[PDB]
Ligand binder design. Sequence first.
Ligand code: CLA
Ligand code: CLA
Ligand code: CLA
Ligand code: CLA
Ligand code: CLA
Ligand code: CLA
Ligand SMILES: CC1=C(/C=C/C(C)=C/C=C/C(C)=C/C=C/C=C(C)/C=C/C=C(C)/C=C/C2=C(C)CCCC2(C)C)C(C)(C)CCC1
Ligand SMILES: CC1=C(/C=C/C(C)=C/C=C/C(C)=C/C=C/C=C(C)/C=C/C=C(C)/C=C/C2=C(C)CCCC2(C)C)C(C)(C)CCC1
Ligand SMILES: CC1=C(/C=C/C(C)=C/C=C/C(C)=C/C=C/C=C(C)/C=C/C=C(C)/C=C/C2=C(C)CCCC2(C)C)C(C)(C)CCC1
Ligand SMILES: CC1=C(/C=C/C(C)=C/C=C/C(C)=C/C=C/C=C(C)/C=C/C=C(C)/C=C/C2=C(C)CCCC2(C)C)C(C)(C)CCC1
Lengths: 31, 34, 306, 441, 31, 37, 19, 75, 31, 182, 61
Amino acid sequence: MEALVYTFLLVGTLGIIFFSIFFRDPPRMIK
Amino acid sequence: MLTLKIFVYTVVTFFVCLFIFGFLSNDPARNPGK
Amino acid sequence: NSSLWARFCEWITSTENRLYIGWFGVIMIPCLLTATSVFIIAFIAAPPVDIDGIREPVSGSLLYGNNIITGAVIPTSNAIGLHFYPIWEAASLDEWLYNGGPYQLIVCHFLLGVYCYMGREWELSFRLGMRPWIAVAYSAPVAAASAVFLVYPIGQGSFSDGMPLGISGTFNFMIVFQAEHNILMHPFHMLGVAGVFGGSLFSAMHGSLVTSSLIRNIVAAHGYFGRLIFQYASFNNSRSLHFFLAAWPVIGIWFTALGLSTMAFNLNGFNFNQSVVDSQGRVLNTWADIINRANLGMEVMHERNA
Amino acid sequence: GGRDQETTGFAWWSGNARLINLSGKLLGAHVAHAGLIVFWAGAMNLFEVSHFVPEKPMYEQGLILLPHIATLGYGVGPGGEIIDTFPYFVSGVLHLISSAVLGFGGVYHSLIGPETLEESYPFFGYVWKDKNKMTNILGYHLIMLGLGAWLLVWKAMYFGGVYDTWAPGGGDVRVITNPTTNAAVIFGYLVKSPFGGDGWICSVDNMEDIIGGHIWIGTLEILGGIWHIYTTPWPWARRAFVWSGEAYLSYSLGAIGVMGFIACCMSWFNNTAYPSEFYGPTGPEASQSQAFTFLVRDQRLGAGLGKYLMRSPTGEIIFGGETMRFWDFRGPWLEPLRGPNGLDLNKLKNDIQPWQERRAAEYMTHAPLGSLNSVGGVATEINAVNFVSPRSWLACSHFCLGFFFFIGHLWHAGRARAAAAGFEKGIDRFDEPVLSMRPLD
Amino acid sequence: IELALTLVSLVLVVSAGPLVVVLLSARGGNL
Amino acid sequence: KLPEAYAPFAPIVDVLPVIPVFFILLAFVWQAAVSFR
Amino acid sequence: PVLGWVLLGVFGTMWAIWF
Amino acid sequence: RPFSDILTSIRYWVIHSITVPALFIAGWLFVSTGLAYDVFGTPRPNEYFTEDRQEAPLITDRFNALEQVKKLSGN
Amino acid sequence: IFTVRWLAIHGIAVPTIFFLGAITAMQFIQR
Amino acid sequence: ARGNDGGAYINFGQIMYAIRTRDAAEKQWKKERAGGNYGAGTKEIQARNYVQRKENERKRREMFDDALAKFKENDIQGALVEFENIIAMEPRNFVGDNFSRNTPIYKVTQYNIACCYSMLDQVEEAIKSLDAAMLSGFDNYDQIRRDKNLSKARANPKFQAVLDKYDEPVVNWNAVKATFGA
Amino acid sequence: MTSILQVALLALIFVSFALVVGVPVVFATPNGWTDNKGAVFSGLSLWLLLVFVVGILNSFV
Ligand code: CLA
Ligand code: CLA
Ligand code: CLA
Ligand code: CLA
Ligand code: CLA
Ligand code: CLA
Ligand SMILES: CC1=C(/C=C/C(C)=C/C=C/C(C)=C/C=C/C=C(C)/C=C/C=C(C)/C=C/C2=C(C)CCCC2(C)C)C(C)(C)CCC1
Ligand SMILES: CC1=C(/C=C/C(C)=C/C=C/C(C)=C/C=C/C=C(C)/C=C/C=C(C)/C=C/C2=C(C)CCCC2(C)C)C(C)(C)CCC1
Ligand SMILES: CC1=C(/C=C/C(C)=C/C=C/C(C)=C/C=C/C=C(C)/C=C/C=C(C)/C=C/C2=C(C)CCCC2(C)C)C(C)(C)CCC1
Ligand SMILES: CC1=C(/C=C/C(C)=C/C=C/C(C)=C/C=C/C=C(C)/C=C/C=C(C)/C=C/C2=C(C)CCCC2(C)C)C(C)(C)CCC1
């Protein structure tokens, strides 16, 4: 069962990477 | 597995030809100014 | 309108994509994706590999009782040697897995991908109209990766000597490398360690000085730095300071990669064994001798004869 | 009397970049550098011959140039014995004197002389952007290289012979008379795979192939030089290259770095252009020698099978143990004992000549293992043996040099293309290319 | 004996380099 | 080894190999005298 | 000879499309 | 004061020239005469293995340490 | 002049020269 | 130099013809650039520049079509005016996706002006326009020597001088023949 | 003739030492090469002839 947990954690990290790459936040002013 | 070898060779050669022809298609660098 | 070739060529070299492709990306992207997919599948589930070629396989899959910290993609078997081992040369898929072919596949595709990645860095730098030297900086990690995965196996005559694509595998590689070669007592590894530590030092100091400068500047920070450690005429220009930042770690990593590559041909580090002796030629121990004792333990312990 | 940063724009550390346009100064610099090269060659040759003893083998004294002359077949008897050492001395002295001449020439052309040669000597003066006369110079130097290769061929075929280590009963100098000029075999090496078992051009075996290849390359080089002198680049070439001094330098750097890697591998693995008698055994050679000597000593006391041979993945008999990785080894002392199915037991049992055993033991003693402070043995071994194989030094040094010159290719190629484009100095701050692009959303 | 001769020869030879520079600085050269 | 006729000139031969590395130092000192202008 | 055949096929295909 | 003034000064040069070599020779003598071997307690090459003890020494004592070091050393 | 600069420079230098002489003599110690 | 609103400052076409024949909004971006910041004002400046470039290219294409129509009606005059207008309002520092460094219509405009002056009696300006076209990267060299419109320019030796400067004979037949004879 | 070879070779070393310093001095010194044609030419000729002399003497022995 541990393999499922490890794989899910890795996939979640990759999903966060994908979200950060593509669903980026538009810049604000001043920044 | 001859089929796998042929497929891989075809893909590799296609990509390499694409690379070479793409770098040929570019035009030489030049400075518009001066 | 425009031929299909024209549109397709324009698309590749288009700069409106979210991630630039370019003419180096045509070779980088498929190679890197192949390596990624094969690596993921092999890591998650792959049969044990007979690394030493003595019918004693090592299991490194996540499905064969390994953690993340323990799982790895075992390198090819010793029996294969340096021979090219594609899928189509193996007798059968199970035979291909049992001899660690996926390691060779991943290494080859990954090396091609990183080289093309350096090329792509240069090409986008040219497209944007900036000076083309980020690729030179990137060449350092690429050089180290080439040394670990390709040059060292060549020198040692087998692909089983490359670094396993794992964590505990990395530690095992490092320990065995120290056993065979005094990596620690080699001037190039010392340069690499100095490069890494100096990179950390300079990053921290530059970040702190710049952050404390911005208040709502450069002269005040320079005065503070000069008063601190007696360097008033050191890196006054911002350009000089940033070039020094770039140069120090890159030179360090170049030299450590070269050290590893040279050790691949059995040119080891310093050897101060029994260098100090008193009258009547009796050996007086030193710290080098205790390092030698540890190296002897590591060496003798992994010599698994059959 | 050099320029200054404000006069030229290059800091002192970038001083040599001030010679890009001046021709006479550049030529003098190049000639002086060639003088340095030849000076080092001669001085090192003299040093090695001064610190040489013919009795000991040539690879137990840290010699890297005497082996090169020996391979040419000068003062060498059958089996690698030294007859007379005079040829090494004469070679060193000739190099030293020629280097003195080159040094004088370079110093003259650099200090006092026409800075630009195009004013008074249209034949020699040149401009980088020009393409016809750059190809003319390329052709001249191609002809020179072809003449050098043909000189090697003529030396091999006439006026003595090269040292062929594969001659029966221990190698000896032989006059090559039937070099292999077949195109198929010659280009098989170039199309040969670089991975294990094949090893690209490092797998050359017999000196006949070497001489045939040199014949082919000399002919091709002479023809190419003649062609380049009388021809100008076709439009496609002019449309796919940057024509400036730095671009030519970048191309040279890339080519020479690749050649450095090739030399590293060839020195490490090859044993026909680098006879083991002079450069010592290779790593695989040492491992195979150890296994073979153990087998011979074991069977001597006894007086696959014999707990020293096993079956390779393909299915033939190879030396067993940890040395199964080096089953591609092909040594002159061991080929006579190899049959169609790798090693053959009967020949091993019955016809092991004494000389092969002595050579195998000698190679077993000195394996390519060493330390940076010139201490032999494995790393954990105490300070008792002083030996670092010449092959190790050569391979390491030339790998490092090849890597640095590849870095040089990257740097100078990037700079050349940026300068040709025109935005090398920086971003113009007025109409920046990025400001004219759709925001990344 | 020979060792001392080696050192004196090395000293003379290595000083032969800066000698040219110093003479040119005094006598007058391009530099 | 080196011929007996030239034996007494062994030390100079031993010194020759290290000469070329002095040229870069010569260039550096030459710049130093010129003050890196 | 699979290499030679594949390369000849790919080059011919590209050239034929153009011609 | 400025660096150039002291660099080109005469008193500085004369005093440092007459003083520094004396101190260099003083250090040389400190090493050569054997005084360094005594003040810091470093054994000379010959007295590493005393007749009483032929192996490396060992303290195994804290409060009586001084006397045991006296005994272990050859004095 | 006996300002802080003089004191610091001499404190760092005098022992440095002493130790340099000590080590140079140490080189020649017969083993 | 073409002005913001027509005309010419040191119509542009009308003035150039005779000679040859003879902050408030974009402040936030500046302040952000003063520091090492990207921000949002830079984004609006980028969008404005991109839309302006697209509109400019559209306008240049339309007036090129207008000049072609004028040729169809046999009006060299307004067509030449349009051509040098197109040239006048070319982007200052344009890097194409294929590393072109010049807008693709620039080369054809140069060639069209060269042809216009080839028909017109005045020639040397045709040579200058052809040289500009060659430098801009008019890669195809065949109608340079085949077009009947350019025969008048071909009469002048400077035509061949420029062509040899850019299109040089690949092989020197004279040199090889002389060597063979000797 | 061995002593003859040694003395001639020592003279060759001395003249080489003179050349490796004088010639750069002649070149670098402004208008110092036009007024010393004979001196440097004679030095080079003597150097070359002495090299040949040493070579031929070695050839005898
Ligand atoms: C590649 C190196 C190189 C190049 C391009 C030149 C080019 C030039 N030199 Mg320089 N020179 C060189 C090396 C070089 N020289 C060296 C090494 C020396 C030291 C001897 C000199 C000494 C020297 C002097 C003293 C003078 C020149 C002059 C000249 C100019 C006139 C050509 C000439 O000498 O007429 C001679 C040309 C001939 C064709 C006559 C026949 C020469 C035959 C072909 C000799 C061939 C030698 C052979 C190939 C050697 C191969 C050796 C190989 C194994 C390495 C010309 C710009 C003259 C000048 O105008 O000043 C700037 C001048 O006064 N040179
Ligand atoms: C081996 C490498 C090499 C070579 C061949 C050259 C060659 C040259 N350099 Mg470069 N340079 C180098 C390394 C090199 N440099 C390095 C490492 C640096 C960094 C410090 C520089 C920095 C530099 C700058 C900043 C400039 C040059 C310039 C020059 C040119 C003129 C220099 C001059 O007038 O000297 C004059 C030298 C002296 C007056 C003192 C030395 C006198 C002699 C030559 C010393 C050697 C004597 C020799 C051993 C005896 C020969 C005997 C023989 C006759 C038998 C010359 C072509 C200049 C130039 O032309 O740029 C436009 C220039 O501005 N160089
Ligand atoms: C690539 C060419 C090459 C090769 C393969 C060799 C190989 C060899 N030489 Mg030769 N040599 C060379 C060039 C070469 N040398 C040059 C150019 C010189 C002139 C300076 C010499 C002068 C020379 C002498 C005088 C002698 C040798 C000897 C030897 C042998 C022993 C070397 C040894 O003990 O290592 C010693 C290794 C080191 C001291 C380590 C050096 C590592 C590199 C060079 C340092 C690089 C700089 C550093 C990393 C930069 C710092 C960067 C900064 C940011 C920190 C060995 C066979 C010896 C021998 O046995 O001859 C019979 C000998 O007596 N060599
Ligand atoms: C006539 C045209 C011509 C010719 C013949 C050459 C020839 C040469 N040039 Mg080039 N050069 C030319 C025009 C020419 N150049 C022009 C127009 C320029 C621009 C100014 C240059 C600029 C230039 C530079 C900048 C440099 C050269 C160099 C060289 C020499 C390199 C030798 C070498 O390393 O070969 C390697 C291979 C061999 C030596 C093998 C060949 C063996 C010999 C030569 C052939 C056998 C027959 C021979 C004639 C017998 C010799 C007898 C002798 C022992 C007495 C070579 C002699 C380089 C050099 O160092 O020159 C000294 C160099 O750095 N040249
Ligand atoms: C160092 C020596 C040298 C150098 C620098 C050059 C340089 C050049 N040659 Mg010359 N040449 C040489 C030796 C040399 N040549 C010799 C020895 C011969 C006799 C065989 C020739 C015969 C020759 C001909 C007949 C022609 C040239 C041309 C050219 C120019 C075009 C670039 C090029 O070579 O194609 C490099 C290739 C490309 C830029 C395109 C890539 C195509 C593939 C990938 C590589 C080429 C095939 C390759 C050789 C086979 C192995 C493939 C493998 C890499 C996969 C360039 C100026 C051409 C030109 O216009 O000059 C008149 C030309 O038509 N050369
Ligand atoms: C024959 C090859 C060649 C040639 C002709 C040139 C020529 C030039 N280079 Mg390039 N370069 C080369 C190879 C070459 N380079 C290589 C291989 C590299 C990678 C390391 C570089 C990296 C490089 C950079 C990064 C830069 C240049 C620059 C320059 C210009 C000025 C030279 C200079 O800095 O002054 C003389 C140089 C010095 C005084 C520096 C010497 C210090 C070195 C590091 C000491 C090393 C000593 C050590 C013993 C070496 C062995 C190390 C061992 C570990 C292997 C000049 C046009 C500069 C320029 O302005 O470009 C236009 C510049 O910024 N080059
Ligand atoms: C310009 C310059 C430079 C450089 C230069 C150079 C690099 C030069 C070189 C030069 C050279 C490179 C020279 C050479 C010379 C040589 C000689 C002069 C020789 C001699 C010889 C002899 C004398 C011999 C002897 C002998 C013999 C024969 C053998 C054995 C014995 C005896 C040893 C006795 C630099 C950059 C630094 C800077 C600036 C200036
Ligand atoms: C002598 C010898 C031999 C042989 C030899 C030979 C045969 C050689 C050949 C050689 C060759 C045959 C070579 C080739 C080479 C090639 C190359 C080197 C290529 C390159 C390429 C490039 C570099 C490209 C580039 C580019 C492109 C891709 C396009 C456009 C852009 C650019 C320009 C970037 C033998 C083995 C018998 C024996 C031993 C020795
Ligand atoms: C073969 C022969 C010969 C020749 C010789 C020669 C050719 C020589 C050369 C020589 C040379 C050519 C030398 C040079 C030297 C130099 C030097 C000795 C320098 C030094 C420098 C320094 C020590 C520096 C320092 C510094 C620092 C620390 C940092 C950086 C910069 C400076 C400057 C500041 C003889 C006569 C033996 C004999 C006869 C034969
Ligand atoms: C001591 C000795 C000897 C020796 C001998 C002899 C006789 C030597 C000689 C040597 C010599 C006698 C050397 C020479 C050298 C020279 C050279 C190294 C030159 C070079 C030149 C050049 C490189 C040029 C170039 C050019 C010209 C100028 C012309 C045209 C253009 C050109 C650029 C091509 C003997 C065996 C007796 C004995 C043992 C020891």
